[PDB]
Structure 1
Amino acid sequence: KVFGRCELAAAMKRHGLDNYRGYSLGNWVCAAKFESNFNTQATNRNTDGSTDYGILQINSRWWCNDGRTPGSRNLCNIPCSALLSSDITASVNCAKKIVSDGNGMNAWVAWRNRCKGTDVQAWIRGCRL
């Protein structure tokens, strides 16, 4: 399931992301756009033994358990399966932890390299949330 941009924006806002730890809603929609093109089923399996999962491409080396990633670390305390739902509950809850347990949204390579320093509110203005 791909989300439409404004549908996702509304869902993210209704899960508390608009201005979360200083990141306006547009940051999160932009991150999703460039991490996964809004695809809840996106998966990127890596040579280090980790995999990036779901709409925010959260990486299994640190944040979720998929039963096979070296170190078996799970800082969001979720199965990586929960990051592949059209239910964004786990992706949102885990993203909040990531931003609190580190150097903010720099955890997301696509945010850092595509969304940072831009007018990220462009991604949500037309939704009028």
Structure 2
Amino acid sequence: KVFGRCELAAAMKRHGLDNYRGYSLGNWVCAAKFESNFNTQATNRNTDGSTDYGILQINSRWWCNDGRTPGSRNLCNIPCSALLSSDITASVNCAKKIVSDGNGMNAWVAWRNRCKGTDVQAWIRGCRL
């Protein structure tokens, strides 16, 4: 599924991400545009060989098991495939654990590099609140 911007905002909020560990909603919506262009199915290899999955791009080395990444820890007890669904719950439960891993949203290179230090309220401007 490809989400709409405000559609994803409402699900992220429902799922308890608005202000989770202090990160407001334009952050998460912003992380999700640039990690995946809003697409629950997006998958991208990393050099280290790991793969990033889904609407936030949750990485198989620590976070989900894809069976082809050496040393996987599967710290969300989950199959990476299940993060590609249309039901963002497993991605948002795991994203809550990542962000809580100490470096905050820095765990997302695209957040650092492109969201951070910006007015990330443009990302929800026009959304029913």
1:84 aligns with 2:84: yes
What do the CA deviations read for 1:78-126 (whole angstroms, capped 9, x no partner)?
1101110010001101100001113100000110000001111110121
What do the CA deviations read for 1:33-58 (whole angstroms, capped 9, x no partner)?
00000011100022322100001011
- Which structure shows the bigger proportion of residues in helix conformation? 1
2:49 aligned residue: 49
Q: Distance in 2 between matches of 1:49 and 1:125?
A: 37
Asked if 1 retains the 8 angstrom alpha-carbon contact of 2:30 and 2:123, the reply is yes
1:117 aligned residue: 117
2:104 aligned residue: 104
Aligned positions, number = 129
Q: Distance in 2 between matches of 1:101 and 1:51?
A: 19
RMSD: 0.9
What do the CA deviations read for 1:9-64 (whole angstroms, capped 9, x no partner)?
00100000000001001100000000000011100022322100001011111101
Local SS of the residue matching 1:55: coil
Asked if 1 retains the 8 angstrom alpha-carbon contact of 2:63 and 2:72, the reply is no
Identity %: 100
1:22 aligns with 2:10: no
Q: Distance in 1 between matches of 2:37 and 2:107?
A: 18
Task: In structure 1, list runs of 5 or more residues that go unmatched.
Answer: none
Q: What TM-score results when the alignment is normalised by the length of structure 2?
A: 0.96
Q: Distance in 1 between matches of 2:82 and 2:121?
A: 28
Task: In structure 2, list runs of 5 or more residues that go unmatched.
Answer: none
